Scaffold this motif. Sequence first.
Motif, PDB file in Angstrom:
ATOM      1  N   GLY A 177      87.379  50.044  62.441  1.00 20.14           N
ATOM      2  CA  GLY A 177      85.998  50.483  62.402  1.00 20.14           C
ATOM      3  C   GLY A 177      84.669  49.765  63.311  1.00 20.14           C
ATOM      4  N   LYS A 178      84.743  48.436  63.345  1.00 17.30           N
ATOM      5  CA  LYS A 178      84.167  47.582  63.984  1.00 17.30           C
ATOM      6  C   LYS A 178      84.190  47.301  65.455  1.00 17.30           C
ATOM      7  CE  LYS A 178      83.217  42.561  63.661  1.00 17.30           C
ATOM      8  NZ  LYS A 178      81.587  42.902  64.103  1.00 17.30           N
ATOM      9  N   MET A 179      83.232  47.000  65.945  1.00 17.75           N
ATOM     10  CA  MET A 179      83.166  47.773  67.674  1.00 17.75           C
ATOM     11  C   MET A 179      83.666  46.311  68.097  1.00 17.75           C
ATOM     12  SD  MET A 179      80.895  49.119  70.294  1.00 17.75           S
ATOM     13  CE  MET A 179      80.436  50.209  69.893  1.00 17.75           C
ATOM     14  N   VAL A 180      84.712  46.066  69.081  1.00 17.94           N
ATOM     15  CA  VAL A 180      84.465  45.353  69.630  1.00 17.94           C
ATOM     16  C   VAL A 180      83.827  44.683  70.285  1.00 17.94           C
ATOM     17  CG1 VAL A 180      87.085  44.106  70.879  1.00 17.94           C
ATOM     18  CG2 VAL A 180      87.237  45.663  69.272  1.00 17.94           C
ATOM     19  N   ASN A 181      83.611  45.417  71.323  1.00 16.15           N
ATOM     20  CA  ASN A 181      82.916  45.411  71.746  1.00 16.15           C
ATOM     21  C   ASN A 181      81.238  43.976  71.665  1.00 16.15           C
ATOM     22  OD1 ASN A 181      83.577  47.879  72.697  1.00 16.15           O
ATOM     23  ND2 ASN A 181      82.812  48.001  74.085  1.00 16.15           N
ATOM     24  N   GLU A 182      80.690  45.490  70.491  1.00 16.65           N
ATOM     25  CA  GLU A 182      79.533  44.594  70.282  1.00 16.65           C
ATOM     26  C   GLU A 182      80.262  43.491  69.637  1.00 16.65           C
ATOM     27  OE1 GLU A 182      78.457  46.560  66.363  1.00 16.65           O
ATOM     28  OE2 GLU A 182      76.213  45.845  66.106  1.00 16.65           O
ATOM     29  N   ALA A 183      81.083  43.284  68.778  1.00 15.49           N
ATOM     30  CA  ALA A 183      81.298  41.570  67.818  1.00 15.49           C
ATOM     31  C   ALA A 183      81.257  40.758  69.166  1.00 15.49           C
ATOM     32  CB  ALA A 183      82.872  41.879  67.209  1.00 15.49           C
ATOM     33  N   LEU A 184      81.948  41.242  70.366  1.00 18.34           N
ATOM     34  CA  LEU A 184      82.177  40.200  70.966  1.00 18.34           C
ATOM     35  C   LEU A 184      80.506  39.145  71.729  1.00 18.34           C
ATOM     36  CD1 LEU A 184      84.875  41.068  73.310  1.00 18.34           C
ATOM     37  CD2 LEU A 184      84.723  39.044  72.849  1.00 18.34           C
ATOM     38  N   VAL A 185      80.117  40.801  72.127  1.00 22.05           N
ATOM     39  CA  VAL A 185      78.121  40.226  72.508  1.00 22.05           C
ATOM     40  C   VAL A 185      77.817  39.257  71.061  1.00 22.05           C
ATOM     41  CG1 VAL A 185      76.395  40.825  73.153  1.00 22.05           C
ATOM     42  CG2 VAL A 185      78.309  42.462  73.592  1.00 22.05           C
ATOM     43  N   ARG A 186      77.965  40.085  70.189  1.00 25.28           N
ATOM     44  CA  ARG A 186      77.170  38.966  69.100  1.00 25.28           C
ATOM     45  C   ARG A 186      78.085  37.847  68.397  1.00 25.28           C
ATOM     46  NH1 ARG A 186      74.588  36.795  66.208  1.00 25.28           N
ATOM     47  NH2 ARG A 186      73.943  37.492  63.984  1.00 25.28           N
ATOM     48  N   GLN A 187      78.479  37.556  68.587  1.00 24.30           N
ATOM     49  CA  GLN A 187      79.362  36.104  69.132  1.00 24.30           C
ATOM     50  C   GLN A 187      79.191  35.010  70.751  1.00 24.30           C
ATOM     51  OE1 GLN A 187      79.753  37.161  65.145  1.00 24.30           O
ATOM     52  NE2 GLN A 187      79.665  34.907  66.151  1.00 24.30           N
ATOM     53  N   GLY A 188      78.276  35.784  71.021  1.00 19.87           N
ATOM     54  CA  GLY A 188      77.950  35.268  72.315  1.00 19.87           C
ATOM     55  C   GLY A 188      78.978  34.682  73.739  1.00 19.87           C
ATOM     56  N   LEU A 189      80.244  35.185  73.280  1.00 12.32           N
ATOM     57  CA  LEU A 189      80.721  35.575  74.047  1.00 12.32           C
ATOM     58  C   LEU A 189      81.664  36.443  74.822  1.00 12.32           C
ATOM     59  CD1 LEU A 189      83.950  35.313  71.089  1.00 12.32           C
ATOM     60  CD2 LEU A 189      83.303  33.022  73.260  1.00 12.32           C
ATOM     61  N   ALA A 198      72.308  43.115  69.701  1.00  7.80           N
ATOM     62  CA  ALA A 198      73.663  41.442  69.241  1.00  7.80           C
ATOM     63  C   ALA A 198      73.176  40.572  70.450  1.00  7.80           C
ATOM     64  CB  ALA A 198      74.978  42.570  69.243  1.00  7.80           C
ATOM     65  N   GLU A 199      73.372  40.732  71.767  1.00  2.00           N
ATOM     66  CA  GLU A 199      72.878  39.912  72.461  1.00  2.00           C
ATOM     67  C   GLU A 199      71.701  39.875  72.278  1.00  2.00           C
ATOM     68  OE1 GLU A 199      72.114  39.425  77.089  1.00  2.00           O
ATOM     69  OE2 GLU A 199      74.038  39.753  77.408  1.00  2.00           O
ATOM     70  N   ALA A 200      70.794  39.948  71.512  1.00  2.00           N
ATOM     71  CA  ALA A 200      69.663  38.802  71.124  1.00  2.00           C
ATOM     72  C   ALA A 200      69.715  38.527  70.260  1.00  2.00           C
ATOM     73  CB  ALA A 200      67.733  39.973  71.373  1.00  2.00           C
ATOM     74  N   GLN A 201      70.574  38.924  69.600  1.00  2.00           N
ATOM     75  CA  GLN A 201      70.830  37.596  68.237  1.00  2.00           C
ATOM     76  C   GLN A 201      71.491  36.545  68.584  1.00  2.00           C
ATOM     77  OE1 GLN A 201      72.366  41.469  65.848  1.00  2.00           O
ATOM     78  NE2 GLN A 201      70.587  41.029  64.831  1.00  2.00           N
ATOM     79  N   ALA A 202      72.311  36.847  69.138  1.00  8.04           N
ATOM     80  CA  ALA A 202      73.626  35.612  69.736  1.00  8.04           C
ATOM     81  C   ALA A 202      72.959  34.608  70.352  1.00  8.04           C
ATOM     82  CB  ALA A 202      74.896  36.108  71.139  1.00  8.04           C
ATOM     83  N   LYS A 203      72.109  35.445  71.667  1.00  8.93           N
ATOM     84  CA  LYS A 203      71.321  34.101  71.881  1.00  8.93           C
ATOM     85  C   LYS A 203      70.118  33.317  71.288  1.00  8.93           C
ATOM     86  CE  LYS A 203      69.936  35.508  75.901  1.00  8.93           C
ATOM     87  NZ  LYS A 203      68.682  36.587  77.040  1.00  8.93           N
ATOM     88  N   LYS A 204      69.510  34.081  70.182  1.00  9.07           N
ATOM     89  CA  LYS A 204      68.615  33.086  69.957  1.00  9.07           C
ATOM     90  C   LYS A 204      69.146  32.615  68.686  1.00  9.07           C
ATOM     91  CE  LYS A 204      64.405  32.257  67.554  1.00  9.07           C
ATOM     92  NZ  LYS A 204      64.208  33.773  66.390  1.00  9.07           N
ATOM     93  N   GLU A 205      70.450  32.647  68.312  1.00  5.40           N
ATOM     94  CA  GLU A 205      71.238  31.807  67.033  1.00  5.40           C
ATOM     95  C   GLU A 205      72.055  30.412  68.209  1.00  5.40           C
ATOM     96  OE1 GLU A 205      74.037  34.347  65.427  1.00  5.40           O
ATOM     97  OE2 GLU A 205      72.636  34.772  63.772  1.00  5.40           O
ATOM     98  N   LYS A 206      72.409  30.599  69.813  1.00  5.19           N
ATOM     99  CA  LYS A 206      72.353  29.487  70.721  1.00  5.19           C
ATOM    100  C   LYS A 206      73.643  29.805  70.555  1.00  5.19           C
ATOM    101  CE  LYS A 206      69.153  27.368  72.944  1.00  5.19           C
ATOM    102  NZ  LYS A 206      67.289  28.063  72.323  1.00  5.19           N
ATOM    103  N   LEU A 207      74.499  30.738  70.526  1.00  3.64           N
ATOM    104  CA  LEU A 207      75.915  30.783  70.287  1.00  3.64           C
ATOM    105  C   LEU A 207      76.463  30.905  71.385  1.00  3.64           C
ATOM    106  CD1 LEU A 207      77.244  33.220  67.340  1.00  3.64           C
ATOM    107  CD2 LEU A 207      76.487  30.925  67.115  1.00  3.64           C
ATOM    108  N   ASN A 208      77.680  29.783  71.926  1.00  2.00           N
ATOM    109  CA  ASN A 208      78.401  30.287  73.140  1.00  2.00           C
ATOM    110  C   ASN A 208      78.472  29.639  74.170  1.00  2.00           C
ATOM    111  OD1 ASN A 208      80.812  29.367  71.499  1.00  2.00           O
ATOM    112  ND2 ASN A 208      81.098  31.481  70.129  1.00  2.00           N
ATOM    113  N   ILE A 209      78.449  31.267  74.820  1.00  4.71           N
ATOM    114  CA  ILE A 209      77.866  31.430  76.193  1.00  4.71           C
ATOM    115  C   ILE A 209      76.061  30.829  76.370  1.00  4.71           C
ATOM    116  CG2 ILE A 209      76.703  33.024  77.730  1.00  4.71           C
ATOM    117  CD1 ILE A 209      79.628  34.489  77.902  1.00  4.71           C
ATOM    118  N   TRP A 210      75.545  30.773  74.990  1.00  8.91           N
ATOM    119  CA  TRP A 210      73.945  30.717  74.991  1.00  8.91           C
ATOM    120  C   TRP A 210      73.637  29.582  74.308  1.00  8.91           C
ATOM    121  CZ3 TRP A 210      72.408  34.310  78.125  1.00  8.91           C
ATOM    122  CH2 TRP A 210      72.797  35.430  78.233  1.00  8.91           C
ATOM    123  N   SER A 211      74.815  28.840  74.779  1.00 12.65           N
ATOM    124  CA  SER A 211      74.020  27.206  74.006  1.00 12.65           C
ATOM    125  C   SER A 211      74.278  26.721  75.217  1.00 12.65           C
ATOM    126  CB  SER A 211      75.518  26.246  72.862  1.00 12.65           C
ATOM    127  OG  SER A 211      76.659  26.381  73.714  1.00 12.65           O
TER     128      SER A 211
END
Length: 129
Positions: A84-96, A116-129
């Motif tokens: 039930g969890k969208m893989v596409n969304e989960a990747l973006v949400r993790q900064g991957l 999702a991407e905005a949230q990852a970026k705000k968190e400085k996750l992974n690609i946005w670190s």
Amino acid sequence: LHKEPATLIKAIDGDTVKLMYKGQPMTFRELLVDTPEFNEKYGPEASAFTKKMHENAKKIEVEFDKGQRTDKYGRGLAYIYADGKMVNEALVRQGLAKVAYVYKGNNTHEQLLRKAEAQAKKEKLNIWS
Ligand SMILES: Cc1cn([C@H]2C[C@H](OP(=O)(O)O)[C@@H](COP(=O)(O)O)O2)c(=O)[nH]c1=O
Ligand SMILES: [Ca+2]
């Protein structure tokens, strides 16, 4: 849009997977995302993330958008769901993955993924670190 069944045949990389759909083996390329190639920074992490999410799922589903269902290489274009969890969304949400490849008529989940991407970026996750 409608979710339809599929089963995992094999992980490939962060944004491609081999699934059996309507009883036929296909490579699927995830809509609206771009992961780093395995050879690049965060590529291995993206591959690993996608591999785990698919392998651990009891149920995989594919959801085609309103447009083109296959790309020029014969890859299926879909949103992929693991229990039930969208893989596409989960990747973006993790900064991957970055939101990418947003073509008119296959962009139903664009805003969801951009959020999702905005949230990852705000968190400085992974690609946005
Ligand atoms: C995600 C996606 C990729 N593609 C094509 C565009 C790119 O063409 P080129 O191969 O000519 O660059 C390629 C990027 O995929 P990858 O990121 O898997 O390489 O796949 C589509 O045509 N539709 C899509 O929805
Ligand atoms: Ca890629």
